[PDB]
């Protein structure tokens, strides 16, 4: 982030022209080359390279070649970067010094999914709702209202039920200078603890299961309560159609008088551990709503260990924002969400004082958030998350489609 | 377009695309749930192409057949208020005559919007949710095509514009765009819900 914010070339886009302004005071850009690329949903379509000849504090106009105009649905992204072809006393050849990304043009997907011939079958006991489609099974616990288990063939896919999550393992900025012996009550973690966010209990209110013309609809309503006060209400719909996809719509209302939650999302522990995480979204590195300008939108493929940031004092980490697609093992999640994926739960991160005491758990913990709080950083002894990065809207909506290999 | 009968309701789902010269500008997906109490819940999900200019509003529009003397609403302010001009409005239960819901600007335009509205009652109709609205005897089309306010004529019924989202109006000057970015509808995807019920 700092490298991106302190870069010596500023970029402006106007139509098909890039204005490059040099922030150097003395030197000409004699070791600078502008590479550009246009991609549709991470698939490259056009690229080129233009030498930079910019006077100190000057401007250079670069007219782009006729950019591709695909008919396929997707969003066009233009990325430019400045490369130093020659090594210097402090950098190697090929060093990237500055970069910038713009959204070029979006084509909305208006093509409909072809109607399926099969229909998922619903079975209703007092304990659970079971939905069967080919080799796939979904089981919802009727006592709790949450999706409790998933089957592909005969292999269980979940270890912990998919449930709403409104908290995160507190950061150094969340804690502030609050101490166990000397409590600072203005700190975010103190306000969350006093409000009962970490101890709030989900209580099922309504649960309906219906069969449509070509799908099965599960609707649930949950209230989170602490000492008689309702902090959050979550209303969820699950639509499982004949293609095996499960669309989940989540609508959450937050009491205006409780402190704004750290996140609004879903959380589950996947049973399988995979080597790689693939995602169409922002950046290769961990990025957050208030720290994401240095992340770029693309298709990223990392090892799972790369999705965890080894902070000395464990906390919420590894989040990737602006994510449209996430692939892990046989599972794919589509929508518009943030996520983190690791072998450590938020609970273990909260209750572990040092990172060497962390131990990997049985499966993979996935946190898919519709909304996430900013992390702050102006200082670490007072709240520093700006109001535009707090979750203060009171009502929140998101959607995510969960599908498997097929 | 799908129509299904549930255990205790009827569900209508529709999907619409708005297209101009081959380009899809907006997609609207709507669900209608009518249960046994007569209530009709409408959920609206709209996606806006990132390259089209940000829309002035995302809402629903209809012309009600009946004309009523009063408009009642639990929401912001007695006076017309907008997302970027609403600090002077207060949240309460307001009851006005219908003529008070129209602002007679000399050159007709969008007017009379009330933001932050949780409940709206007009005649036998009640709309609940979290929305902005304006209600009048003039359509947006007539306001656009009328040069002076004395040329306006009242139409047969009541035009109701219930918006989930509305653009700011600006005002720094009147010769360049002045609506701040926080008051433009740039999110790309938008969701709202409104329950429509009648006397009962």
XYZ file of C-alpha atoms in Angstrom:
606
model
C 0.000 0.000 0.000
C 2.711 2.475 0.962
C 4.636 1.676 -2.210
C 1.537 2.415 -4.272
C 0.690 5.594 -2.376
C 4.234 7.004 -2.602
C 4.880 6.167 -6.261
C 6.487 8.885 -8.373
C 4.141 8.598 -11.378
C 0.486 9.616 -11.184
C -1.920 8.391 -13.843
C -5.117 9.844 -15.275
C -7.441 8.182 -17.785
C -9.483 10.143 -20.345
C -11.189 8.088 -23.034
C -8.325 6.138 -24.599
C -5.565 8.491 -23.401
C -3.363 8.054 -20.330
C -1.845 11.176 -18.801
C 1.341 10.300 -16.897
C 2.527 12.979 -14.475
C 6.038 12.657 -13.065
C 6.532 13.469 -9.387
C 10.316 13.566 -9.736
C 11.838 16.974 -9.078
C 15.232 16.619 -10.765
C 15.562 13.513 -12.931
C 14.224 12.650 -16.359
C 12.448 9.305 -16.704
C 15.336 7.675 -18.561
C 14.907 4.188 -17.021
C 11.127 3.921 -17.267
C 8.847 1.873 -19.521
C 5.042 1.916 -19.428
C 3.443 -1.493 -19.886
C -0.330 -1.689 -20.239
C -2.822 -4.534 -20.418
C -6.571 -4.900 -20.937
C -8.324 -7.897 -19.405
C -11.879 -9.224 -19.233
C -12.534 -11.044 -15.939
C -8.828 -11.783 -15.669
C -8.451 -12.959 -19.273
C -5.952 -10.763 -21.167
C -7.035 -9.373 -24.537
C -4.542 -6.644 -25.469
C -1.228 -5.336 -24.181
C 1.590 -3.030 -25.194
C 4.651 -1.194 -23.970
C 5.490 2.499 -24.354
C 8.771 4.176 -23.326
C 8.351 7.020 -20.855
C 9.895 10.405 -21.683
C 8.662 12.717 -18.915
C 10.449 15.815 -17.679
C 10.610 16.374 -13.903
C 7.118 17.408 -12.770
C 5.959 17.116 -16.388
C 3.296 15.190 -18.266
C 3.280 12.632 -21.074
C 0.193 11.670 -23.068
C -0.082 8.057 -24.234
C -2.834 7.312 -26.738
C -3.934 3.732 -26.462
C -4.433 1.448 -29.467
C -8.014 0.599 -30.366
C -9.019 -1.396 -27.311
C -10.950 -4.668 -27.666
C -14.732 -4.461 -27.286
C -15.912 -7.978 -26.369
C -19.542 -9.021 -26.634
C -19.159 -11.605 -23.860
C -20.388 -10.572 -20.428
C -17.781 -9.258 -18.016
C -15.969 -6.129 -16.862
C -13.017 -4.673 -18.775
C -10.001 -3.604 -16.713
C -7.038 -1.540 -17.886
C -3.820 -1.951 -15.892
C -0.698 0.143 -16.444
C 2.644 -0.328 -14.707
C 6.038 1.361 -14.860
C 8.988 -1.013 -15.240
C 12.662 -0.142 -14.895
C 14.303 -2.203 -17.674
C 17.824 -1.594 -16.340
C 19.142 -2.283 -12.864
C 20.228 0.554 -10.582
C 22.361 0.688 -7.452
C 19.227 -0.081 -5.418
C 16.962 -2.049 -7.788
C 17.235 -5.017 -10.134
C 16.276 -5.031 -13.805
C 12.530 -5.231 -14.362
C 11.673 -3.451 -11.099
C 8.075 -2.230 -10.932
C 7.885 1.268 -9.442
C 4.336 2.529 -10.093
C 1.028 1.112 -11.290
C -2.641 1.980 -11.722
C -5.874 0.239 -12.693
C -9.138 1.525 -14.165
C -12.492 -0.035 -14.948
C -12.979 0.343 -18.698
C -16.424 -1.009 -19.611
C -18.841 -3.590 -18.233
C -21.228 -5.866 -20.114
C -24.094 -7.116 -17.963
C -24.931 -10.807 -18.261
C -28.443 -11.112 -19.718
C -28.156 -14.758 -20.819
C -30.413 -17.093 -18.853
C -29.443 -20.497 -17.438
C -30.916 -23.202 -19.651
C -33.883 -24.858 -17.957
C -32.966 -28.101 -16.218
C -34.820 -31.399 -16.553
C -34.276 -32.618 -12.982
C -35.783 -31.110 -9.831
C -34.171 -31.286 -6.364
C -36.202 -33.467 -4.007
C -37.116 -32.300 -0.505
C -37.641 -34.515 2.549
C -38.902 -33.123 5.851
C -38.317 -34.652 9.263
C -38.762 -32.768 12.522
C -34.980 -32.733 12.954
C -33.864 -31.572 9.515
C -34.627 -30.559 5.944
C -32.888 -32.795 3.396
C -32.523 -31.888 -0.284
C -31.270 -34.433 -2.825
C -30.077 -33.740 -6.383
C -28.106 -36.491 -8.086
C -25.064 -37.209 -5.947
C -25.438 -33.950 -3.985
C -27.238 -33.528 -0.667
C -27.924 -30.513 1.546
C -29.054 -30.914 5.156
C -30.448 -28.018 7.202
C -30.815 -28.403 10.963
C -34.390 -27.499 11.894
C -33.534 -26.884 15.555
C -30.893 -24.290 14.623
C -32.070 -23.276 11.144
C -28.558 -23.360 9.660
C -27.259 -25.450 6.782
C -25.624 -28.222 8.787
C -24.167 -30.636 6.234
C -23.368 -31.079 2.543
C -22.696 -34.328 0.682
C -21.005 -34.985 -2.643
C -21.419 -38.676 -3.279
C -20.902 -39.990 0.249
C -18.296 -37.482 1.498
C -19.364 -34.853 4.022
C -18.197 -31.397 2.954
C -18.644 -29.474 6.223
C -17.243 -29.767 9.733
C -18.982 -26.702 11.241
C -22.388 -25.448 10.032
C -22.570 -22.377 7.815
C -23.697 -19.648 10.212
C -23.843 -15.866 10.352
C -20.798 -14.054 11.718
C -20.792 -10.466 12.968
C -17.465 -10.363 14.840
C -13.773 -10.620 14.030
C -10.719 -11.449 16.094
C -9.747 -7.960 17.310
C -6.834 -6.129 15.714
C -4.243 -4.022 17.501
C -6.311 -1.016 16.403
C -9.479 -2.631 17.769
C -7.841 -3.248 21.151
C -6.050 0.077 21.441
C -4.391 0.503 24.819
C -7.217 -1.349 26.576
C -5.759 -3.741 29.147
C -7.231 -6.487 31.304
C -6.166 -4.616 34.441
C -6.728 -1.144 32.901
C -9.775 -1.218 30.623
C -10.208 1.567 28.070
C -13.954 1.608 27.270
C -13.813 3.723 24.098
C -11.872 0.984 22.281
C -13.777 -0.981 19.648
C -13.182 -4.396 21.223
C -14.379 -3.095 24.594
C -17.574 -1.731 23.032
C -18.190 -5.023 21.211
C -17.616 -7.033 24.402
C -19.883 -4.785 26.474
C -22.636 -5.046 23.844
C -22.424 -8.845 23.838
C -21.426 -9.269 20.191
C -19.030 -12.105 21.037
C -21.567 -13.791 23.352
C -24.754 -13.188 21.339
C -26.869 -16.293 20.730
C -28.716 -17.043 17.507
C -32.364 -17.980 18.037
C -34.420 -19.385 15.177
C -37.683 -17.509 14.575
C -39.124 -18.877 11.315
C -38.174 -21.785 9.063
C -40.015 -22.633 5.840
C -39.270 -25.264 3.196
C -41.079 -25.272 -0.149
C -40.761 -26.902 -3.557
C -41.113 -24.595 -6.563
C -41.516 -25.430 -10.235
C -37.776 -25.996 -10.684
C -36.129 -25.461 -7.286
C -36.335 -25.852 -3.519
C -36.615 -22.774 -1.300
C -35.466 -22.703 2.327
C -36.203 -19.541 4.304
C -34.974 -18.917 7.843
C -35.053 -16.045 10.312
C -32.603 -15.643 13.191
C -32.312 -13.129 16.014
C -29.138 -12.534 18.013
C -29.901 -11.527 21.585
C -27.825 -10.515 24.584
C -29.283 -9.809 28.038
C -32.724 -9.314 26.521
C -31.663 -6.991 23.678
C -31.830 -7.989 20.013
C -28.588 -6.872 18.342
C -28.939 -8.429 14.878
C -31.695 -10.028 12.826
C -30.719 -12.217 9.872
C -33.222 -13.396 7.258
C -31.899 -15.871 4.716
C -33.250 -17.606 1.642
C -31.706 -20.708 0.072
C -32.656 -21.551 -3.515
C -31.384 -24.898 -4.822
C -32.244 -25.464 -8.484
C -31.738 -28.372 -10.871
C -28.167 -27.441 -11.803
C -26.950 -28.048 -8.241
C -26.351 -24.360 -7.507
C -27.401 -22.990 -4.114
C -28.143 -19.261 -4.092
C -28.136 -17.686 -0.625
C -29.663 -14.262 -0.044
C -28.905 -12.654 3.324
C -30.689 -9.609 4.765
C -29.424 -8.317 8.108
C -30.767 -5.543 10.318
C -28.515 -4.107 13.031
C -29.852 -2.232 16.048
C -28.832 1.406 15.731
C -27.786 1.662 19.388
C -25.421 -1.301 19.423
C -21.845 -0.568 18.291
C -21.395 -1.083 14.571
C -20.374 -4.698 13.869
C -16.913 -5.613 12.653
C -18.427 -7.614 9.792
C -21.614 -9.049 8.332
C -20.930 -12.369 6.662
C -21.101 -16.142 6.741
C -18.664 -18.539 8.380
C -18.092 -22.276 8.016
C -15.371 -24.877 8.491
C -14.828 -26.866 5.307
C -13.913 -30.516 5.811
C -11.282 -30.707 3.058
C -7.875 -29.020 2.876
C -6.685 -27.883 -0.551
C -3.268 -26.738 -1.713
C -4.383 -23.674 -3.684
C -6.909 -20.852 -3.471
C -8.115 -19.311 -6.738
C -10.140 -16.119 -6.900
C -11.300 -13.458 -9.327
C -11.050 -10.368 -7.148
C -8.786 -7.675 -5.718
C -5.059 -8.062 -5.341
C -2.724 -10.907 -4.526
C -1.972 -9.482 -1.071
C -4.281 -9.093 1.911
C -6.456 -6.002 1.473
C -9.231 -4.330 3.469
C -11.951 -1.754 2.715
C -9.792 1.136 3.973
C -6.505 -0.407 2.753
C -7.097 -1.682 -0.794
C -5.882 0.940 -3.300
C -2.721 -1.084 -3.981
C -4.671 -4.256 -4.786
C -5.548 -4.927 -8.420
C -8.521 -6.787 -9.842
C -7.509 -10.038 -11.522
C -7.492 -13.830 -11.330
C -5.141 -14.783 -8.488
C -3.910 -18.268 -7.569
C -2.013 -18.653 -4.297
C -1.073 -21.448 -1.919
C -3.253 -21.672 1.169
C -0.365 -20.626 3.430
C -0.157 -17.397 1.406
C -3.720 -16.564 2.505
C -2.663 -16.201 6.160
C -0.650 -13.233 7.422
C 1.622 -14.275 10.315
C 1.114 -11.251 12.556
C 3.000 -11.657 15.831
C -0.171 -11.166 17.874
C -2.883 -13.170 16.063
C -5.905 -11.290 14.747
C -8.247 -11.119 11.781
C -6.049 -11.366 8.700
C -5.835 -12.414 5.076
C -9.019 -10.746 3.849
C -9.447 -10.183 0.110
C -12.016 -7.563 -0.876
C -13.867 -6.925 -4.127
C -14.036 -10.644 -4.878
C -16.385 -11.900 -7.585
C -15.347 -15.564 -7.701
C -13.682 -17.903 -5.202
C -12.581 -21.466 -5.995
C -11.327 -23.824 -3.287
C -11.119 -27.541 -3.952
C -14.405 -28.534 -5.592
C -16.295 -25.504 -4.226
C -17.042 -22.249 -6.047
C -18.633 -19.148 -4.525
C -19.844 -16.358 -6.805
C -21.158 -12.916 -5.994
C -19.668 -9.695 -4.627
C -17.999 -10.366 -1.294
C -14.874 -10.269 0.820
C -13.330 -13.453 2.158
C -10.549 -14.948 4.188
C -9.600 -18.626 4.188
C -7.223 -20.305 6.622
C -6.629 -23.169 9.049
C -7.320 -20.985 12.107
C -10.735 -19.952 13.367
C -11.532 -16.433 14.523
C -12.016 -17.881 18.015
C -8.524 -19.401 18.080
C -7.031 -16.161 16.756
C -8.793 -14.248 19.545
C -7.680 -16.602 22.338
C -4.033 -17.026 21.250
C -1.537 -14.476 22.562
C 1.391 -15.246 20.233
C 1.492 -16.636 16.712
C 3.804 -19.535 17.588
C 1.083 -20.977 19.847
C -1.363 -21.293 16.936
C -2.202 -24.807 15.753
C -3.885 -25.752 12.489
C -7.404 -27.119 12.843
C -8.934 -30.139 11.126
C -10.250 -28.416 8.022
C -10.407 -25.017 6.347
C -12.152 -22.061 7.968
C -13.822 -19.830 5.379
C -15.179 -16.383 6.261
C -17.243 -14.917 3.411
C -18.394 -11.429 4.386
C -20.918 -9.345 2.560
C -19.582 -6.370 4.510
C -16.439 -5.691 6.538
C -15.292 -2.897 8.832
C -12.237 -0.775 8.189
C -9.060 -1.498 10.114
C -7.905 2.029 10.970
C -4.291 2.920 11.497
C -3.977 6.636 12.243
C -2.904 5.552 15.721
C -3.239 2.470 17.920
C -4.437 4.070 21.178
C -7.779 5.543 20.038
C -10.438 4.561 17.482
C -9.231 5.475 14.001
C -11.690 3.822 11.590
C -13.357 6.575 9.575
C -17.146 6.791 9.502
C -17.311 5.843 5.816
C -15.624 2.537 6.741
C -17.901 1.685 9.676
C -20.917 -0.581 9.182
C -23.530 1.973 10.218
C -26.193 1.555 7.516
C -28.447 -0.477 9.841
C -29.640 -2.779 7.051
C -27.435 -4.882 4.791
C -28.066 -7.214 1.870
C -25.854 -9.640 0.027
C -26.089 -12.721 -2.157
C -23.745 -15.615 -2.852
C -24.078 -18.639 -5.132
C -22.397 -21.842 -3.926
C -21.793 -24.541 -6.536
C -19.576 -27.591 -6.971
C -17.673 -29.244 -9.813
C -20.198 -29.903 -12.570
C -41.194 -14.855 -15.198
C -42.097 -17.527 -12.640
C -45.255 -18.002 -10.577
C -45.394 -20.486 -7.700
C -47.634 -21.322 -4.761
C -45.889 -21.846 -1.421
C -47.233 -23.251 1.829
C -48.827 -19.928 2.797
C -48.140 -17.470 -0.034
C -47.783 -16.885 -3.765
C -44.392 -15.972 -5.232
C -43.975 -14.033 -8.480
C -40.429 -13.591 -9.779
C -39.526 -11.477 -12.800
C -36.339 -10.358 -14.517
C -36.079 -7.285 -16.741
C -33.266 -5.809 -18.810
C -33.173 -2.212 -20.026
C -31.378 -1.908 -23.350
C -30.412 0.975 -25.604
C -28.731 0.533 -29.002
C -27.681 -2.983 -28.041
C -26.242 -2.113 -24.610
C -27.800 -3.328 -21.360
C -27.886 -0.384 -18.934
C -29.891 -1.854 -16.041
C -31.057 -5.288 -14.938
C -33.913 -5.518 -12.435
C -34.849 -8.750 -10.658
C -37.998 -8.615 -8.559
C -39.840 -10.979 -6.256
C -43.468 -10.552 -5.191
C -44.663 -12.459 -2.123
C -48.404 -12.280 -1.416
C -49.370 -14.060 1.805
C -52.688 -14.760 3.511
C -52.902 -11.384 5.256
C -53.158 -9.544 1.926
C -49.685 -8.004 2.178
C -47.502 -7.924 -0.941
C -43.767 -7.815 -0.241
C -41.658 -6.664 -3.196
C -37.907 -7.233 -3.235
C -35.974 -5.394 -5.952
C -32.364 -6.095 -6.950
C -30.868 -3.846 -9.624
C -27.492 -4.009 -11.342
C -26.231 -0.937 -13.206
C -23.565 -1.104 -15.901
C -20.435 0.581 -14.579
C -19.810 2.470 -17.831
C -23.232 4.078 -18.118
C -23.674 7.368 -16.225
C -24.953 6.838 -12.705
C -28.775 6.857 -12.684
C -30.751 9.661 -11.095
C -32.771 7.127 -9.100
C -33.561 3.456 -8.609
C -37.188 2.999 -7.653
C -40.709 2.035 -8.624
C -43.325 4.200 -10.310
C -47.084 3.847 -10.714
C -50.176 5.972 -11.280
C -52.774 5.323 -8.594
C -56.385 5.514 -9.750
C -57.745 7.336 -6.689
C -57.066 10.894 -5.519
C -56.910 11.482 -1.766
C -56.923 14.706 0.220
C -54.079 13.862 2.610
C -50.704 12.128 2.602
C -49.514 10.569 5.866
C -45.986 9.305 6.392
C -43.594 8.225 9.116
C -40.337 9.635 7.789
C -38.116 12.697 7.443
C -39.387 16.234 7.660
C -42.549 18.019 6.645
C -40.776 19.836 3.802
C -39.271 18.415 0.625
C -35.850 16.923 1.365
C -33.184 15.112 -0.658
C -30.165 12.920 0.169
C -27.762 15.885 0.015
C -30.300 18.388 1.417
C -31.991 16.735 4.410
C -30.273 17.879 7.630
C -33.139 20.283 8.377
C -35.782 17.555 8.065
C -36.835 15.735 11.228
C -38.085 12.187 11.637
C -41.733 12.061 12.684
C -45.300 11.300 11.630
C -46.307 13.973 9.112
C -49.770 14.594 7.652
C -50.043 17.061 4.774
C -52.514 17.891 2.025
C -51.605 16.484 -1.370
C -50.962 19.971 -2.776
C -48.316 20.405 -0.060
C -46.399 17.459 -1.558
C -45.677 19.380 -4.783
C -43.159 22.225 -4.949
C -44.223 24.818 -7.548
C -40.821 25.507 -9.089
C -41.112 27.960 -11.976
C -39.453 25.531 -14.387
C -40.971 22.106 -13.601
C -38.636 19.345 -12.451
C -38.394 16.478 -9.993
C -39.752 17.803 -6.709
C -41.451 16.947 -3.443
C -39.257 14.007 -2.457
C -39.280 12.863 1.173
C -36.302 10.771 2.258
C -35.796 8.406 5.183
C -39.414 7.264 5.017
C -40.477 4.141 6.898
C -44.244 4.301 6.353
C -46.451 5.947 3.723
C -50.260 6.034 3.861
C -52.340 7.331 0.954
C -56.038 6.567 0.772
C -56.417 2.858 1.526
C -52.805 2.037 0.576
C -49.851 1.618 2.933
C -46.220 1.136 1.903
C -43.665 0.071 4.509
C -39.911 -0.245 4.297
C -37.003 2.187 3.988
C -37.477 4.389 0.944
C -37.820 7.860 -0.498
C -41.004 8.940 -2.232
C -42.784 11.719 -4.019
C -46.521 11.818 -4.695
C -48.298 14.268 -6.984
C -50.735 14.766 -9.857
C -47.936 15.288 -12.405
C -45.840 12.562 -13.984
C -42.087 12.836 -14.425
C -42.709 12.864 -18.184
C -45.050 15.862 -17.970
C -42.603 17.679 -15.693
C -39.829 17.064 -18.237
C -41.853 18.249 -21.250
C -43.401 21.367 -19.653
C -41.397 24.591 -19.876
C -43.308 26.667 -17.300
C -45.284 25.651 -14.234
C -48.481 27.415 -15.324
C -48.734 25.038 -18.304
C -48.917 21.981 -16.029
C -52.244 20.149 -15.855
C -53.286 17.597 -13.250
C -53.602 14.043 -14.532
C -56.375 11.540 -13.857
C -54.952 9.954 -10.728
C -51.986 10.160 -8.372
C -48.437 9.519 -9.557
C -46.349 7.824 -6.867
C -42.568 7.491 -7.161
C -41.148 5.197 -4.468
C -37.365 5.088 -4.806
C -35.058 2.725 -3.032
C -32.236 5.089 -3.975
C -32.042 8.682 -5.201
C -29.274 10.896 -6.549
C -28.187 14.112 -4.897
C -29.351 17.414 -6.333
C -26.155 19.474 -6.133
C -26.156 23.218 -5.790
C -22.580 24.496 -5.593
C -23.267 26.077 -8.977
C -25.707 25.596 -11.850
C -23.294 25.556 -14.813
C -21.228 22.444 -13.981
C -21.926 19.122 -12.237
C -21.998 19.661 -8.481
C -23.357 16.415 -6.997
C -20.670 14.974 -4.735
C -19.486 11.410 -5.288
C -21.005 10.200 -2.010
C -24.415 11.293 -3.354
C -24.104 9.621 -6.765
C -25.555 6.154 -7.352
C -22.267 4.468 -8.225
C -22.453 1.229 -6.213
C -23.376 -0.817 -9.308
C -25.749 -3.090 -7.382
C -28.723 -1.973 -5.308
C -31.293 -3.750 -3.161
C -34.501 -2.601 -1.559
C -37.753 -3.995 -0.219
C -41.233 -2.562 0.201
C -44.427 -4.056 1.625
C -47.691 -2.884 0.040
C -50.878 -3.497 2.024
C -54.434 -2.172 2.129
C -56.993 -1.365 4.817
C -57.450 -4.533 6.855
